[PDB]
Every structure is written in structure tokens, then in C-alpha cells.
Swiss-Prot record:
It comes from Escherichia coli. GO terms for molecular function: beta-lactamase activity. This is Beta-lactamase TEM. Belongs to the class-A beta-lactamase family. The active site is at 45 (acyl-ester intermediate), 143 (proton acceptor). PROSITE patterns: BETA_LACTAMASE_A.
Length: 263
């Protein structure tokens, strides 16, 4: 609904920065509403969903096991590793790492998982192979969050990310067991509460992944819908703002409040 575009452009104004937005019908793939849908924005942590999608594709192909245990050390820990920092002694399994990477947005977990698939080049090759010729991961945590103006490294476009999430959550790309596992990790959450979830009505479903990087970058990707089932995909990214995290979170929550109201 155009009233949501009023809020999205108001958010750009309030934040003094670019906001990218897209609302997609999950079943049909139809773009219902958009703003700067084909401009690039840093993915930040939202890439972790794509990463675990690739991991699950490997699991399906018999090239990985969710129960495989990965051992790491203090040497491996990067900034923001709330879960991995507690398991240095006995390690964590692949399943546990994706749960950490998605529900807590653990950065070290993402790096360990990236290593299992062959690094950024392989995640990018996975995306290209699934029809996403835009989204690219080029670096590891923490550098991938640099958000350098006009830099195409580690970026996606709202339309591309929305289309990719749709394929991951509904396409024959993954087995049903794997699709649901990805959805289960996205439904769980300990960090995106101030975002779309703060505007979600009781009874509604939401599977999401947020992100925050340098230079004011902030974003979220999500599949949500009434009556416990997802029916639309929403992608929101912003970069360039000097606003506080609370201010950026509120704008994303208000964009969510609008799209829900006009559903
Ligand atoms: C992803 O965008 C980053 C990166 C460090 O992996 C992480 C860190 C953060 S902000 C720290 C805690 N978040 C919220 N309480 C996020 C994030 O999305 O908020 N992901
Ligand atoms: K429209
Ligand atoms: K555009
Ligand atoms: K160790
Ligand atoms: K989540
Ligand atoms: K949210």
C-alpha cells in the first residue's frame, strides 16, 4: 500500500540516509511495494541466512552433517561471539553454529560455517548457481560489515535478497526437512525484538534475520504472515545514517507497523 511508502520515505528523511525496501508475495513472487529495490546495500548479518541455506544444501547433498562437531579456539573468536565464546572447550556442531549465527547473530559462528563451505567465494557461487546474480559475499567477519559508500563488496539489493529468501523458503532448492530447519532457526530470536517483531500482531508468524554494521548500516529480512503462517517477504536495509541504533530500530519498527496495518 502506498501509505507504507509514505513511512519509508519519511524514514529516509528522519535518518538522513538511503532506505531500501521491498514487500513480496511469498506464494506468487509478486512485488507488492518497493523503494530503491535495485540499489545495493551492505547485507551485514543478513547473509547468515544465505550461509546456512548453503550449509543445508550441502547436508541434503550428503556433503555435510548437522551433527558434525567443529572445534575452535580463542584465536578464532571475533567481535560479537556471545555463544561461541562459551564453547571453546568442547566445540559446537554445525546445527548449533547455524542456530547461533541466526538466532543470536554470533559472528564467529558465521566465520566457522563459512569455512566449512569454502569461504565467501563459494557462498557467492552458491547464490549465482541458484539464480541470484546480484548478492555477493567477499569478506569474512568482521570486515564484511565495513559498509564503505559505493563499494559493491558484501552487498545485495532488496529485490535480489527478497527473491533469494523466497526460493530458500519455498523452492525445491532444499528438502522440506532442510527448508523447515532454516525456518525454525529464523523463527527463533534474541536480537531482532526492536524491529519488525515489535509491530507483529499476536498470532502472526515471523522468521527473520537482522543486521547492523559500520557507518550506520542496519537491516532486516523476514517472512511473516497472519495465523501462524508466512505469506509475504519483507526486506529493509539502510546505510549512511548517523542516527543512534534506537532511532534506526524505531524507523524499521514503524515501517513494519505500517505494512501490517495495510496488509
Ligand atoms: C551482523 O550484522 C552483526 C555482525 C557482528 O555479525 C551482528 C551484531 C549485531 S548488533 C549486536 C547485538 N544485536 C542486537 N542486540 C547484529 C544485529 O543484527 O543486531 N548482528
Ligand atoms: K505497487
Ligand atoms: K532501484
Ligand atoms: K578449543
Ligand atoms: K531470527
Ligand atoms: K524483527
Amino acid at each position: 500500500h502506498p501509505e507504507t511508502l509514505v513511512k519509508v520515505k519519511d524514514a529516509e528523511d528522519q535518518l538522513g540516509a538511503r532506505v531500501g525496501y521491498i514487500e513480496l508475495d511469498l506464494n506468487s513472487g509478486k512485488i507488492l511495494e518497493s523503494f530503491r529495490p535495485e540499489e545495493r546495500f551492505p547485507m551485514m548479518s543478513t547473509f547468515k541466512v544465505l550461509l546456512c541455506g548453503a550449509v543445508l544444501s550441502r547436508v541434503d547433498a550428503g556433503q555435510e552433517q548437522l551433527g558434525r562437531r567443529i572445534h575452535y579456539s580463542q584465536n578464532d573468536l571475533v567481535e560479537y561471539s556471545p555463544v561461541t565464546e562459551k564453547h571453546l572447550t568442547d566445540g559446537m556442531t554445525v546445527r548449533e553454529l547455524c542456530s547461533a549465527a541466526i538466532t543470536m547473530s554470533d559472528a564467529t559462528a558465521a566465520n566457522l560455517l563459512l569455512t566449512t563451505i569454502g569461504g565467501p567465494k563459494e557462498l557467492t557461487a552458491f547464490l549465482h548457481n541458484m539464480g541470484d546474480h546480484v548478492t555477493r559475499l567477499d569478506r569474512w567477519e568482521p570486515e564484511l560489515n565495513e559498509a564503505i559508500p559505493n563499494d559493491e563488496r558484501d552487498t545485495t539489493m532488496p529485490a535480489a535478497m527478497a527473491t533469494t529468501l523466497r526460493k530458500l523458503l519455498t523452492g525445491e532448492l532444499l528438502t522440506l526437512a532442510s527448508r523447515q530447519q532454516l525456518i525454525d532457526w529464523m523463527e527463533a530470536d534474541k536480537v531482532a525484538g526492536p524491529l519488525l517483531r515489535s509491530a507483529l500482531p499476536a498470532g502472526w508468524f515471523i522468521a527473520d534475520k537482522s543486521g547492523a554494521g559500520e557507518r550506520g548500516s542496519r537491516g532486516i529480512i523476514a517472512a511473516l504472515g497472519p495465523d501462524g503462517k508466512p505469506s509475504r517477504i519483507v526486506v529493509i536495509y539502510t546505510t549512511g545514517s548517523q542516527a543512534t541504533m534506537d532511532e534506526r530500530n524505531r524507523q524499521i519498527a514503524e515501517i513494519g507497523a505500517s505494512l501490517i496495518k495495510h496488509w
